[PDB]
Curated annotation (Swiss-Prot):
Domain Cytochrome b5 heme-binding residue range list: 4-80
GO CC, alphabetical: endoplasmic reticulum; endoplasmic reticulum membrane; intracellular membrane-bounded organelle; membrane
Membrane topology: Single-pass membrane protein
Location in or out of the cell: Endoplasmic reticulum membrane; Microsome membrane
The protein's name in its UniProt record: Cytochrome b5
Key words, A-Z: Acetylation, Electron transport, Endoplasmic reticulum, Heme, Iron, Membrane, Metal-binding, Microsome, Transmembrane, Transmembrane helix, Transport
Lineage: Eukaryota, Metazoa, Chordata, Craniata, Vertebrata
Known function: Cytochrome b5 is a membrane-bound hemoprotein functioning as an electron carrier for several membrane-bound oxygenases.
Coarse class of the protein's main subcellular location: endoplasmic reticulum
Keyword Metal-binding in annotation: yes
Residue positions where N6-acetyllysine is found in the record: K2, K5, K14
UniProt record, GO biological process: response to cadmium ion
Disulfide bond sites: none
Name of encoding gene: Cyb5a
Molecular function terms from GO: electron transfer activity; enzyme binding; heme binding; metal ion binding
Length: 94
């Protein structure tokens, strides 16, 4: 796809603080900071795995599919292709 913006981990690593907490899931990054007081799970959970792969931490609670679609709302961009291939692959790979 075009237009969309591709972010890298090296960058996200920056916004790894409460002020700006990001999380990568399903080879896709989203805005957690905005979904800090929206997540029916809490904040610590997110922070716990802020600016880092939370595939397991995500699939652990087998996030409902409705979430995979809800995320769209709180979308931010995509995760660099060279980044995803940096840690095998966050959630699935095929
Ligand atoms: C790394 C990040 C995340 C972690 C670690 C996480 C963890 C969890 C956990 C453990 C639950 C259960 C309640 C709790 O103890 O918190 C839960 C539920 C839920 N989470 Fe997350 N979550 C994350 C990100 C997200 C995101 C981005 C969304 C939305 C896009 C989301 C949407 C939901 C919803 C809707 C529920 C209720 C599950 C149900 O469908 O029954 N979560 N989450």
């Amino acid at each position: 796809d075009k237009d969309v913006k591709y972010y890298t981990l090296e960058e996200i690593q920056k916004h790894k603080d409460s002020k700006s907490t990001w999380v990568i899931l399903h080879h896709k990054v989203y805005d957690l900071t905005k979904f800090l007081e929206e997540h029916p799970g809490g904040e610590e959970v997110l922070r716990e795995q802020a600016g880092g792969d939370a595939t397991e931490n995500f699939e652990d609670v087998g996030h409902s599919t409705d979430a995979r679609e809800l995320s769209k709302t709180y979308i931010i961009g995509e995760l660099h292709p060279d980044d995803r291939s940096k840690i095998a692959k966050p959630s699935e790979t095929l």
